[model samples]
Target chain A: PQQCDQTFTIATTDYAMQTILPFALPRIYQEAPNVSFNFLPLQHDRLSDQLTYEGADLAICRPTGPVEPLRSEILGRVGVLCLLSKQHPLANQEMSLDDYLSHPHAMIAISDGVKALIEQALIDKPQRKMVLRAYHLEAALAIVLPIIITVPADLAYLVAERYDLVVKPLPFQFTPFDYSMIWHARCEHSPAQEWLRSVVREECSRLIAKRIE
Target chain B: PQQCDQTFTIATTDYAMQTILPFALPRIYQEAPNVSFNFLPLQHDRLSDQLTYEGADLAICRPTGPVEPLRSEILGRVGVLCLLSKQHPLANQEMSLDDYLSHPHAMIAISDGVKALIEQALIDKPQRKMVLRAYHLEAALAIVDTLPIIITVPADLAYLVAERYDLVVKPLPFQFTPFDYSMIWHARCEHSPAQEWLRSVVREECSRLIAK
Candidate 1:
């Protein structure tokens, strides 16, 4: 174990930043006490450019979109769930597809992965009224009383606990989004970079396993 | 009054988005229930370009940096305070300059206005170690307990995020320029009724925030 003091900058989508890393923070601190971790929430429009320009030492994001030339490894997948205000009319245990489509949706347009899943799911049906479209989840969370939002299962639970909202399983099939670690070839062989990748891989597996059981 | 149901986009800094807009939400909905507001947290480097390109209908940002031609009006000034983890040795009482300088600082590198204010305050003193540099406060908030980082934040935020993160507020030993907020709009939007109504709600909310 080479002990090198370094500040590693990590780029991740908003969901991963809000839900995943905070869960793994204590473990990461114990493993690398001297290493300072800086997080950059990657904008959906600038994913490839961020990695190419070395804006982030490593990235944890959905392995989608144009990532031509960059090397990546699949970490794990996070299931999606529907979030509704506790006072919502359909705050029952399971949310039917019809119930979900009838209400005004509060959506975040920042995640290309979430966008793709949403588009495919609603392909056969008439468009649902999207009353709120925001760049961040917090904005939607603020308007929970009037709208229903779809987010990663863990995030739905996390925010539900904080906001006292209701979490219902999605009735329709949605392929759980795969979260991956990506890096440019420039740091392909660096020991420090490799160590970070390993840490994330292990942490993601541990969390996903716990989430499953 | 035009009854157009056009969605309005607002560009603002993250700090304002988190602390300020929540106060304005109820008022906004009451006035413009059918109007949708799209809030974009603009990059410090892209403040002007965002406005010039019509990406945002209005912008709320610190009145600093380069804004050659955009028209703006000051809303209010927010004083800066220092936040320390409750576990810090000096967290029990007021922090002296010597004690403040001794601990490493966690700083946000975004916001030209904040950077300018910080640079002016530390102009004469030997550079203190900035152990952490981040784009947002939440990043620094996560590491506060482990590292004795004294962060500069608006006074209201010490209470806003204090419950979630164990932080104690201390008045800064050295003075920082009060963070002044300004609303700017493209010249083309000078006469838009919807934009005018939104601006009034924001201005009213800010005045109430200062009064409290």
Candidate 2:
């Protein structure tokens, strides 16, 4: 058994806390039988600062969103794209930029990256005001309102139950997320850390299995 | 303007802090513009107990749950009921005891009189395994897999969304929280020669909100 020096903290967004890694630390404790883990899921930007200040042993997120100044690995593929209601008038039509422009949309709030996307999509045409807004995709789905767009693949399965929703390809392409898992690169090749990355990869696969098409 | 001679402590739950009152403190500084109403929102029970032992002004919450030789007022009508997702199959339905038993639920994790209601609900069907759990409702809603069955009322809206979210709101039918706010007074309050009126005002608002 690898002896952990102490329980380590893993800070990520509140999104990961509830859906993917809920009770992860406790589960790892049960599996490893000794080493402890503390999962600190925080608000997105706050989580970014926390990991920088406290230095997380491992950070998992969409590859495009953050760069945890640590050694990182692309744990698994994460797709950033769009979602459409099953009943959308354009649901069956071949998706294209023009069609999406005519429809109302929703996006997450971040410092500037997402705002740029919203502006780029609306720059030339009569802007279609997003019919609804939410803190995150989960909140957007609560109203059972669809036509909201998101990149998190996992939300597709969770939001489809009530909303007539479907994961659609982004009308305009950006880089595929390939959401990465990052850790202090200095710890590279450390046996315990190698094992942790493996465990994280496994957890990611498990969460994705239920969502991915 | 009323003058406060002593510093008082009120035990604020995530509920009281977010909902009914969002200020870090009462605008006593603004109200009296002079007298200070200092309060602490204790995230832990130990901290509240510490303040209680120190004889800080007054603590909120009924002494009925935690044993403290403190006076308590079953304050005004506050609600600690469950909220459902607007799209939840049960959201608009007339709920029955069976509905709750079948649903996945989240609740506060304290051994209060409220546990008895859950117990009574579960006793009738021993075989039903309700996936019940706890989380600080003030914190983000963590049920990404499925929408959480939340326990809150109008007061805790801030904790739900810093600005806002589109989630629907509902009152839980459980008796665990019929009237939400309650205030507790440490034994010190009984003998306070000067603070009696202040205590009466706090207690009165809590108990008589409905009567008024």
Candidate 3:
């Protein structure tokens, strides 16, 4: 087995780890023998800013809806919505737009899709009523159960299973979030990384579709 | 299997995970049924301070010496000093105080015994030169071969091996890294004062090599 002396650290959100990391990282290691990888978790743009300074080789995040100087691609679709625990009171409720509006929601959608949906949903209402906005799923899960939001997602379900919890689907319907894979343009052509990048998208699709066997 | 709903977090050095944690933490969870546990890596006092506010319930560190307002104890007797890598240049030579002075060193001593040895050896110079003063052994190991002065004991060898690096021993001229375990209790202790204090006593004794 060949090992790469060069280490690549990535700045990413919880979704990237859940959806992209499992397959993308391992395949990259297998195909591009010169890269070791690690991840630093952060919310969207902040994670991008961290990539510039925190010595990460690349960043994996959603498109910030602004043209950035960095190199990027829309890797895959990630659902941008609230996840409720199956044990929540609304777990059995039918999926309907009006049902979503009637209940309290706990969400952490910093930019783009989630924010836009919230804006459209509460356009007529003067004040928007919701529980809390959290970056990590763990915190959201802790607070959601108490408020009636009833679930958390964004973080890996493995972490929830470690604590014995399940994801609940929200009744609100909206488009899934776009997971964008980004890196500094300066490093785009570096050595075996080009090969690594090609397989990264494939691996991401595998992980998002199902748990790795 | 039984699971607890409450969450708990602990900040500790990577060194403690090997022996001290395997023996100590289970008892804590057993007694405090409401508290679930998490682990945070504390690089030094600065990282510990960050963890203190980041919801770390307790922190364990070996004191450099006597410090005020925090309780401490001697954990165990560990070698005062040694050479790090087998590839280290000085490994072939018969080691002595003078031999150590020639090579650039990574002098990071945590325990009282090891610090005293380094101080005594370098007393004539008043200020000793080193490549870097790392806060923890993990940081030290990364650059140990490149640097000259590496302060660590036998217990730390386990971590060095995780990376599959072989270390050569260079006995200190006198004594260098005497490893001791100490738990630091911050001024605030109302949450579980009695239980944490009791663990401190246990963690201290747990490191003792011969019950002394």
How would you class the docking of model 2?
Answer: incorrect
- What lDDT score goes with residue B22 in model 2? 25
State the displacement of the C-alpha of residue B188, model 2, in Å, after optimal TM-score superposition: 41
Tens digit per residue, CA lDDT, model 2, A1-213: 456535455655433544455533334544564454444333344444545666566665543365555567675654445666677676676678777777656553221344455466556766654543332344334332235465454545445544557766766655434556666655567777788777777777766775564
In candidate 3, what are the lDDT values of residues B1-212, reduced to their tens digit?
A: 13433444555553454345545544543454333344444445354453446565555566555645544445555444465566666767777766666655554323334456557656775343444332233334544434444444444433333244456666666544455556655546534655454455456536542242
lDDT of each: 0.72, 0.49, 0.50
The true-versus-predicted C-alpha distance at residue B166 of model 3, in Å, is 31
TM-score of candidate 1 on Cα atoms, chains taken together: 0.87
**Top of the candidates by TM-score:** 1
Question: In model 1, what are the clashing residue pairs, if there are any?
Answer: none
Native A-B interface contacts kept, per candidate: 0.22, 0.00, 0.00
DockQ of each: 0.40, 0.04, 0.04
- Sort by DockQ, top down from the best: 1, 3, 2
lDDT of 1 at B92: 96
TM-score of chain A of each: 0.91, 0.65, 0.72
Q: Candidate 1: list runs displaced more than 4 Å.
A: A1-3, A108-110, B1-4, B52-54, B108-113, B126-129, B135-141, B164-166
Docking quality tier of model 3: incorrect
| Per-residue alpha-carbon lDDT of candidate 3 for residues A1-213, written as tens digits (9 for 90 to 100) | 245445556665544544345435444544544444445444354555665666666677765566367788877666543455656665566545555665545454244345665567556654423544333333344433223332223443544444444454544544556677777766688864555566777766665566434
Instruction: Report the number of the highest-lDDT candidate.
Output: 1
Ranking by lDDT: 1, 3, 2
Tell how far residue A151 is off in model 2, in angstroms. Answer: 4.1
Model 2 misplaced regions, further than 4 Å? A1-8, A22-30, A33-38, A41-48, A63-69, A85-88, A91-96, A108-126, A161-164, A184-194, A205-213, B1-212
In Å, what is the interface RMSD of model 1? 3.0
